[PDB]
Design a protein around this ligand. Structure first.
Ligand code: HEM
Lengths: 106, 54, 53, 54, 57, 423, 49, 446, 146
């Protein structure tokens, strides 16, 4: 259904994504997340392929940050191509903690 | 950077007499110091989360 | 985020520790009164009136 | 085994200043900790030599 | 005269939520103790013997 | 006066699921789901899968988390257990009367909606090593496990416990594949104690209508014979000598069960000389050291193993086995009084009736029956079946042992333990 | 053989309230903890002074 | 469909009669084709002196091995031929002899039990054979680290008292107990007011009473007679025994405060509390997710191979606490977590966990009393200790009464600022000093 | 043991002999796991005394003189209080051992009792071996004459 308002909402989201600039280092959104306990558990649950891809992406970014350089524009992560690979692991970890917290109430 | 420049402003007002423009702007810089930290920076972090669908 | 600590278990744990928290408050208040020789309270304690005049 | 690694005093120096795993990518802005330590020893040494006459 | 393990002989294992692991069969050990010294690994790298959740009021 | 007992209620569904219930008006209830899913249904490519499954019952399901299962059961003071034989898995659940529904829901989620999440599966793999190590501290467990691998080409050859090489290697997909293949309506029996028949029937129709699995009850267990020998130096020799006997539910199985009690199963008296035990007295004549003997009887869907089990001193192993083997030979040769068969029938009949005294023993008996036979047989007809065994049937069963291709397993110091060959 | 392990006589060192083997110690535990904690109480008062 | 509450009422009344003897004869009738029958005696190692100690256990070894009417193996032959099972035990307080038999075999079962309990042969050649059997059982019991720590716990907690003594007695007593020592034990102790004939299963009470009058007549019916002792109370001592043995792969620790007796109403609330701490074993499903904080942390942090709570009851005293089995580097952590749970329950037991403890007890009680054998044992033991059978509905009423306030008062009475008895066996270097165990018995924040 | 048993061939040939023999040639070259930590100084002393004797021994030298070896043998290798010679006698039995591994490749060995070394029959077995085919002769060859 939804057309004109949605693309503008997406436009501000896409604008901010580019201004954030983790994509200039080849980072995905989920690579940049602060490692709390919920997050560390989500990393631990990642499958082999995704875990190893995550590390290479961090390494390549820390390497760039040391040299104070960025990737060629060709190689920046496109907002449309940004895979929220951690989110469903993290969501489930949060859901598990919240159930424990409800049981601890009663 | 608005905090840093607010602090520069406060260091300027610190070093000047308690007289006409300096009083009211010293008050405004003092409000803004506590506004940036207690209110404005924690609102920016929340907006930035919402913007990244997080 | 501190909604976590609201529920019947946490109310019961509050109730269990409250005579202890108030008795510690009693230790602290009498302790501060003793250590400073505090005037307002210690004039009103019927022995320990060793100021007089 | 190294002397540096297991000598009870040199252990502490090793784990703080030699073999300490550090981020590859820490900037200029991370220099200020050592610089604060330098500042403290500078204030100590000059201050003692002032205390000799003050 | 059914049940495979309660025909008494072949091995059953049990895991539980709250209760200790079992292995049971009719192999002998009661009349093996009776002429004596089976100096048994009882609470070596091990478990706990006889059935818990078993107390009176 | 107690209440006059209710009868057992029994229902086969068109899908092949059996439901059985008794209302003994008891403060606690017991629910078992019994499945044709024991270790015999493993092949070469997936050994130990049913071990890891037996250990996976409080892992996360579609309807309840790992945490919920453990806390919800414990809150009502309940139990969840999984009992495996080579043929069956049995998922049992005990709670007070008022709490059946929560325990049912948990039971249904474990058996029909398990998730086998990769990380929960991974965290569980070292439990295989612990559970095996605890079980294998009885020398009897290693002997009976070797005995079956010696006996069978095939299927009953499989260990109850995971092979060491497989620890760490059993996959989420294999667990999912095992449940889909085996936890189906045609391979399943829902047994309840102190619940109504309509409540069980409602559970079975709503939640236990599964089929896309396997056609029934084996690859067929190919008896083979042979020997496995485990040097141990273990102070005592444990030995088991066996032949192919009779499949469960055949009249011949009953002859084997009586033969067992002629020869001698367990002890009846605390610290007794086992006077009416034929094997014990025959060994005791020429062996003056500490020992044990028992008749061994294991009956299955499509095979059986019968013979004897000996614990002895290393040097006495040969003497004990040969004395025991000759005492069976005496019975095969026809030297068996009618009083002996009648005493042995009395021990069988009392032993069975005592075996079904508890809720635990009754439910396992009703569950196994439902899987093996597709019926409930009351105690008085079990007792009638026992009674119908003639002396000649007992002799014939002993004759089949003596002439049958043998299987042997032994652990200990084996320098004086013979080789089938040498018997 | 572990059954040969009797605990040796502590009658020499025991408080007089707990010498009787046929008397409950429960009857004197209040008095005995009372005495030793009064010692530590009196000390803390003195040290506070 | 019936409630739990209705189901407890539907459990049939224990019938009790007394013989002119003083011999109590008691039964719970059910539908079962099978029964358990037995004799429960107020006799054990608590009744024995230093010179006597191990006599009851010696009598246990001889009880099944010949009578005046059935000599040698003839009793064995009769029990076996009917498909019956004959068993015995001796605790510190109670001896029992029981038959699992077919219900139709109740007359011969009662007949045989009377013959065992009254007319035991004690043939001098048999006493000599049993001497060597008991000594080997001592050598065996030595390898059981659990049996050893519990003997040590009794031996330190009860020190100068007859409750300090093991059941089986020292090896010197085994080698020098005569026939006359045993005859004197049997004469003094196997008296009709001190013994109960118990049955559960497919029997009428009237039939049991008739057999009691047939076979147990003239134990005491002109005699009873001078010199009895009643049981003297047993002093508890806050104390430690430390059998350091580094050759042994795992440490065993048992720790207990003074329980009250059998009789005492607050055994119920102590058991609620003990259920909350629970038991653990390395073969449980649920590491992290177990309700008990001791069980949860012991599983997560690998503190433990096993632990168990216990409330061992004697007349007017008990052993209340916990036993555990662990690695040499885990003893200090296990003790800290164990004691923290006692302190938590004393000061700040909440309601939800008390309900869990209550439910676990309700389930334990009903699960236990399932079969002719545990019900028979319950009849025999209860009539010795309580004088009545306490019905399941009464236990329910006693459990239901317990809330968080009851848990915290009752725990404080026994645990809070109390001297424990400690027994340690094995690689026990990291076992906390007694002063530091003692300091774990109170909280400075409370 | 762990280094040796990383070749699947070592476990197979060790099982092969235990399957073949009742007795003596049945023994592993490598210590049984249950025995690791358990072999005593007395057993080692007993093994040397029983077996390292003159009648059970051969002194072989390459690029030394015969008188120097003969002198060594008479002075230092005159031991006997051991055992009478060359076996308990190896009782061939037959049978099978089967080790599940899942190991990508199956290693199998099938054998019968042949001939004792030094008999003419042993030579027939050795020729039969080369008819049937022992090792390869050509690097990466199709083994045409095997
Ligand atoms: C323990 C080492 C120190 C000693 C013994 C010491 C001693 C001295 C003495 C003797 C003076 C008076 C002489 C003078 O005014 O020139 C002085 C003044 C001063 N101290 Fe320190 N000092 C120490 C470290 C510190 C530190 C850590 C600071 C803080 C950065 C500090 C801040 C100053 C300042 C601002 C003055 C006034 C200088 C002036 O304008 O004359 N000093 N101190």
């Amino acid at each position: 259904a939804v057309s004109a308002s949605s693309r503008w909402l997406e436009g501000i989201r896409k604008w901010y994504y580019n201004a954030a600039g983790f994509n200039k280092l080849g980072l995905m959104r989920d690579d940049t997340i602060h490692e709390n306990d919920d997050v560390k558990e989500a990393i631990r649950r990642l499958p082999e392929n995704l875990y190893d891809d995550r590390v290479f992406r961090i390494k390549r970014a820390l390497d760039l940050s040391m040299r104070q350089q960025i990737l060629p524009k060709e190689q920046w992560t496109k907002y449309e191509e940004d895979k929220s690979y951690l989110e469903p692991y993290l969501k489930e970890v949060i859901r598990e903690r919240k159930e424990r917290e409800e049981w601890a109430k009663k | 950077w608005a905090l840093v420049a607010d602090l520069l402003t406060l260091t300027w007002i610190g070093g000047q007499p308690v007289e006409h423009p300096y009083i009211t702007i010293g008050q405004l810089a003092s409000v803004l110091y506590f506004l940036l930290i207690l209110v404005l920076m924690p609102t920016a972090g929340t907006i930035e989360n919402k913007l990244l669908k997080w | 985020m501190l909604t976590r600590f609201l529920g019947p278990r946490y109310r019961q744990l509050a109730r269990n520790w409250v005579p202890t928290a108030s008795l510690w408050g009693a230790v602290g208040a009498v302790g501060l009164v003793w250590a400073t020789d505090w005037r307002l309270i210690l004039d009103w304690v019927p022995y320990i009136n060793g100021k007089f005049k | 085994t190294n002397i540096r690694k297991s000598h009870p005093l040199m252990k502490i120096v090793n784990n703080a200043f030699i073999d300490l795993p550090a981020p590859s990518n820490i900037s200029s802005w991370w220099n200020f900790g050592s610089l604060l330590g330098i500042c403290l020893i500078l204030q100590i040494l000059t201050g003692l030599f002032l205390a000799m006459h003050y | 005269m059914l049940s495979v393990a309660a025909r008494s002989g072949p091995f059953a294992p049990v895991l539980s939520a709250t209760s200790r692991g079992v292995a049971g069969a009719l192999r002998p050990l009661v009349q093996a103790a009776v002429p004596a010294t089976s100096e048994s690994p009882v609470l070596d790298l091990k478990r706990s013997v006889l059935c818990r959740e078993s107390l009176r009021g | 006066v107690p209440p006059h007992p209710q009868d057992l209620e029994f229902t086969r569904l068109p899908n092949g699921l059996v439901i059985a219930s008794l209302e003994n008006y008891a403060p606690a209830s017991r629910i078992g789901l019994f499945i044709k899913a024991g270790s015999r249904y493993e092949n070469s490519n997936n050994l130990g899968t049913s071990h890891l499954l037996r250990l996976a019952s409080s892992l996360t399901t579609k309807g309840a988390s790992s945490f919920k299962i453990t806390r919800g059961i414990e809150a009502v003071g309940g139990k969840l257990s999984v009992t495996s034989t080579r043929e069956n898995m049995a998922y049992t659940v005990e709670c007070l009367r008022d709490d059946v529904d929560i325990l049912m829901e948990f039971l249904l989620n474990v058996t029909t909606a398990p998730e086998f999440r990769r990380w929960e599966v991974a965290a569980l793999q070292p439990q295989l090593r612990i559970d095996k190590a605890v079980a294998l501290q009885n020398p009897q467990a290693h002997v009976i496990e070797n005995l079956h691998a010696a006996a069978y080409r095939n299927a009953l050859a499989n260990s109850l416990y995971c092979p060491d090489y497989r620890i760490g290697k059993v996959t989420p997909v294999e667990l999912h594949d095992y449940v889909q293949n085996h936890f189906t309506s045609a391979r399943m029996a829902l047994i309840g104690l102190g619940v109504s028949h309509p409540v069980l029937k409602q559970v079975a129709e709503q939640f236990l209508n599964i089929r896309g699995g396997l056609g029934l009850s084996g690859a067929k267990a190919k008896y083979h014979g042979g020997e496995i020998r485990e040097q141990n130096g273990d102070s005592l020799v444990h030995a088991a000598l066996v032949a192919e006997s009779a499949a469960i539910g055949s009249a011949e199985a009953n002859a084997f069960s009586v033969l067992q009690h002629v020869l001698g199963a367990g002890p009846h008296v605390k610290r007794g000389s086992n006077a009416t035990s034929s094997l014990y007295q025959a060994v005791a004549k020429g062996v003056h050291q500490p020992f044990d003997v028992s008749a061994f009887n294991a009956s299955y869907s499509d095979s059986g193993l019968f013979g004897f089990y000996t614990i002895s001193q290393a040097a006495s192993a040969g003497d004990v086995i040969k004395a025991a083997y000759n005492q069976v030979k005496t019975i095969a040769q026809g030297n068996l009084s009618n009083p002996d068969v009648q005493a042995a029938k009395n021990k069988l009949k009392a032993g069975y009736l005592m075996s079904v005294e508890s809720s635990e023993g009754f439910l396992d008996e009703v569950g196994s029956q439902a899987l093996a036979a597709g019926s409930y047989t009351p105690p008085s007809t079990v007792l009638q079946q026992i009674d119908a065994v003639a002396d000649a049937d007992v002799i014939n069963a002993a004759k089949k042992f003596v002439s049958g291709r043998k299987s042997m397993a032994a652990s200990g110091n084996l320098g004086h333990t013979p080789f089938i060959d040498e018997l | 053989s572990h059954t040969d392990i009797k605990v040796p006589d502590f009658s020499d060192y025991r408080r007089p309230e707990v010498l009787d083997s046929t008397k409950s110690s429960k009857e004197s535990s209040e008095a005995r903890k009372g005495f030793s904690y009064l010692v530590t109480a009196t000390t803390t008062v003195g040290v506070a002074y | 469909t019936a409630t739990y509450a209705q189901a407890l009422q539907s459990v049939p009344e224990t019938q009790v009669s007394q013989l002119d003897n003083g011999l109590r004869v008691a039964s719970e009738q059910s539908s079962q084709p099978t029964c358990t029958v037995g004799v429960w005696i107020d006799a054990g190692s608590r009744y024995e002196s230093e010179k006597n100690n191990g006599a009851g256990y010696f009598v246990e070894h001889l009880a099944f091995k010949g009578t005046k009417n059935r000599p040698g193996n003839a009793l064995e032959k009769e029990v076996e031929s009917m498909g019956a099972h004959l068993n015995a035990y001796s605790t510190r307080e109670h001896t029992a002899y029981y038959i699992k038999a077919l219900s139709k075999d109740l007359p011969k079962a009662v007949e045989l039990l009377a013959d065992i309990v009254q007319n035991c042969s004690l043939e001098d050649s048999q006493i000599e054979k049993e001497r060597d059997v008991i000594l080997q059982e001592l050598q065996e019991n030595d390898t059981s680290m659990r049996d050893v720590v519990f003997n040590y716990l009794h031996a330190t907690a009860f020190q100068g008292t007859p409750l300090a003594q093991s059941v089986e007695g020292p090896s010197e007593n085994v080698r020098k107990l005569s026939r006359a020592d045993l005859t004197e034990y049997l004469s003094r102790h196997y008296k009709a007011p001190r013994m109960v004939l118990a049955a559960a299963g497919g029997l009428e009470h009237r039939q049991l009473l008739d057999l009691a009058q047939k076979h147990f007549s003239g134990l005491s019916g002109t005699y009873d007679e001078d010199a009895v002792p009643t049981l003297s109370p047993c002093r508890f001592t806050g104390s430690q025994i430390c059998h350091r043995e580094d050759g042994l792969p795992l440490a065993h620790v048992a720790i207990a405060v003074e329980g009250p007796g059998w009789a005492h109403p607050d055994n119920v609330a102590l058991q609620v509390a003990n259920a909350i701490i629970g038991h653990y074993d390395c073969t449980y499903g649920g590491g992290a997710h177990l309700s008990s904080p001791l069980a949860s942390i012991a599983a997560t942090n690998k503190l433990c191979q096993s632990f168990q709570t216990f409330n061992i009851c004697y007349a007017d005293t008990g052993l209340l606490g916990a036993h555990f089995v662990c690695d040499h580097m885990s003893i200090d952590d296990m003790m800290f977590v164990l004691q923290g749970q006692w302190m938590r329950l004393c000061t700040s037991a909440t309601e939800s966990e008390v309900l869990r403890g209550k439910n676990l007890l309700r389930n334990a009680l009903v699960s236990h009393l399932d079969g002719t054998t545990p019900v028979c044992e319950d009849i025999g033991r209860s009539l010795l200790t309580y004088g009545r059978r306490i019905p399941l509905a009464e236990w329910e009423s006693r459990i239901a009464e317990v809330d968080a306030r009851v848990v915290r008062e009752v725990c404080s009475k026994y645990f809070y600022d109390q001297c424990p008895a400690v027994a340690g066996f094995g690689p026990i270097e990291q076992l906390p000093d007694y002063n530091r165990i003692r300091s774990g018995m109170f909280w400075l924040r409370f």
